[PDB]
Every structure is written in C-alpha cells, then in structure tokens.
Amino acid sequence: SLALSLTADQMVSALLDAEPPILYSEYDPTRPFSEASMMGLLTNLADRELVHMINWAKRVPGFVDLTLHDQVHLLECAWLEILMIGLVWRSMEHPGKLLFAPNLLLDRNQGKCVEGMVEIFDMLLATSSRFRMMNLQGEEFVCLKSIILLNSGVYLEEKDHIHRVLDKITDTLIHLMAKAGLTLQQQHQRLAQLLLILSHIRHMSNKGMEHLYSMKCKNVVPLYDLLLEMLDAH
C-alpha cells in the first residue's frame, strides 16, 4: 500500500487534490418552495453529488486496497455524513445560512417548507458555527472527511489496514497543528475537539436518514435511483 508510505505533507496533498467540485443547483427555481419542490431540488443535487463522492472515495489513500464489498459498505454507511460535513464546510463563512450550492443559499426559515426539516437545519447550522469558532482549516477538513469514510462502517485483515490508515490521518492532523504553532497540549485538545464533532455529524446523519425514509413513504421525494439505493442500504 503506497498509502501507508505517504508522508504527512503527501497525505494532505493527495486529499486536497482528490476534492470533488462544488456543484450548482437547478437554476431559477420557483419561490417560495413547496415541500415537494424543495425536496426535488435538494434530492437532484444530492444525486449528482453522490456520483462525485464515489469517485472521490477511490482517491482517498487506502480505499482502493479494500474489496469491492467493503468499499460498497463504507460508502453506504457514510454517504450522508459526507454530504453533511461538506455542506457544513461550504456554509462556514455564511452565518445563519446553509450553502447547498453557490446559487442556493438557504436560511432556517426556508427549512420549515418541509415537515421535520427545520430540526435538521438547526443542527447543521450549529455545526457550521462550531467550525467557524474553531477556525477549521481546509487541510483539517479533508482529513476529517476521509476519517468519516473509513471509520463509519469499520465496525480483521481489512480492519487492520483501515486502522493503520486512520492512524496515519491522525499523524497528519497533529502535523498540521504542530505547524500552526500549537503547543503539545493545544494539539491534543484540538484533535479531540475535531473528532468529537464527528459524533454530532453521525447523529445528524442518523436523524436525516430517518427523516428521508419518512419523506419517501409520503411520495414527496423524486425517484432518483442512486439516492434511493443508498437510502435502502439502511
């Protein structure tokens, strides 16, 4: 595995170069949104984002070393977590709003257009404000995104390799903090702060998944094959 041989700076480089592009939402949507029209716009975006996510995963060091069955499993378990953290990252510089796409910046009020959605929007906004306060950097963000992919479904030959890569990502994060001039104590504290956020992201994903299976039965969500399969995986 060339992954286990990468240095910290090479790890950061590989992850930064693997970043997916930012996609646009269907243009000139009719406002205000109806429950069905908003979900239509968001599900359309998510479906296209999933295609890019699958290809981003293949570029995450070590992921290629896993079996197709495992790769499928990790993505099925982590896709929504990955969509959410990307959203929280794009929204950092926009207090109070969620930047779903450059041409689609929504406020919590618009989240009331869909039953049960405002609760999820609020958690997402709190996470974004948390990253803002922490002044989360781009190199740290890509590290966290890769940890989500490898850790979310990890729970022996395959497991050991995954744990080794996770350990390398940890080393990378500490490396970045050391360069930022943080003391040893501050490095450990920030590392803990960042990893504990992943607990909240897992929570939002579990809640989002339940709410998604809720909109589904109400025939409010469009029939986007990939998105539906990913949802059925749960």
Next chain:
Amino acid sequence: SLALSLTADQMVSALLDAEPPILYSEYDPTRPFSEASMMGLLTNLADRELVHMINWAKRVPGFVDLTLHDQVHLLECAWLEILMIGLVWRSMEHPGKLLFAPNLLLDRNQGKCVEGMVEIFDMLLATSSRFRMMNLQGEEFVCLKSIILLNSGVYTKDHIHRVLDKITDTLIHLMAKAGLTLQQQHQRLAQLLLILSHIRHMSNKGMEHLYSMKCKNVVPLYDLLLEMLDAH
C-alpha cells in the same frame, strides 16, 4: 468552576469515586425468556440504573456548575449512550456475551427473542470486542463516559468545552503515565474518541427500536424510562 483547577490525578480519582454500583436483575430461573419477559427484565433494570446515573452525573466535575435546564438537556440526550458504554465495559471480561447484570449474562442468540434486538446486540458485542482488543483501562473508561455526558447534547457552552479539554488532558496524562510514546498517545486518543461516534450510532438505533417497542406495547414502560424516551 472548581473542576477546572483539578489536576489529572484528582480528575481521575473524582471520576472513579463517582462510579455507580453494579445492579442485579430481578431473579428468575426460567429459561429461555419470552419477548415480554426479557423486555420486562431489561426495562426494569434500565429504570433502576437511570436513578444511579443521575446521581453519578452530579458527581462528574463541572456538571453541578450547570443550570438545571442544561443538566436535564445533557442527561436526556446521553442516557442511552451512557447505559450502553457501561454495558460494553462490564461485558469485556465475557467475550461473546453481554453482561447486563451479574445474574443476567446474555448471548447473541438470546437477542433474537425480541424482534429487532439482535442487530443492536451485535453492534454492542463488536464494540466490547474493540475495547477488549485495545485493552481499555478502567481509568480511561471513566473519562470516556464523562465525555459522552458533556459532549452529546452540547450543540443542541464555553464552560462545558473547557471541562472537555480538561478530560482530554487527563486521558493523555494516563497514557503518558502508562509509558506510551507521544505518537502512540495521540493515536490512542483518536482511536478512543472515534469509537464514541459508533456509540452514538448505536444509541440512535436503540432509541428508534425502543420507540417501536413502545408503540407495539410489548410491555408497559416505567415512568422515568418513558420520560427519557419521550425527550427524543
């Protein structure tokens, strides 16, 4: 807050001393259990454990410094995660089984007696195996349990965040004292905290399952347990 001035050693001692007692399940020789009898035993135990959890929380450095409203919010969000990590901890000595109580050691097969429960038993057994292989120490366990209490509902705060950094310092202190290199220390720290996201996942799955058990009226739920459930 008095908790912020404590040393790592005092923090560990405080946490160890606040540990709740191990409770026993109601006694009954009859095996195997039925869906209702098993759920009856488990909910009765959970309800009694919750009372001790509340008193344990009050002894967690920094918790009493919060307002009643905040204390309530934290317990409501974290109660199942706390019950689960406790179960995973005492089940470490018994690979392959879940020690709900000294007189109630269950196996995966017994998890099938209740529909939808085997999936949860399996996640819990894997977590226990993970802790067993990492050779989790009692001192690290008490820190993790406290982190769950203070972190789970924190985003739904400067004081709580300051207490969390304190526990982090304590965890590293314990690893350094155990002889781990600087590298092994931050790698072990990350490993431990990542398992917390899995505990969060199990809690959400367990909460969903309990809600459905409730609506199916498989068994009446005790008042405290119902309060904690409805909070979700």
Next chain:
Amino acid sequence: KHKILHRLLQ
C-alpha cells in the same frame, strides 16, 4: 414541567 428527572437532579 414536572419531571422525575427534575426531582432526582435536585
């Protein structure tokens, strides 16, 4: 509101 939790916490 009246909660058993409130009572036990105080």
Next chain:
Amino acid sequence: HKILHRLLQD
C-alpha cells in the same frame, strides 16, 4: 447495492 457497485467498478 446495484448502481453503487457498478460505479465503483467503472
């Protein structure tokens, strides 16, 4: 796990 399977193979 159909589409995801194929996309991961291509």
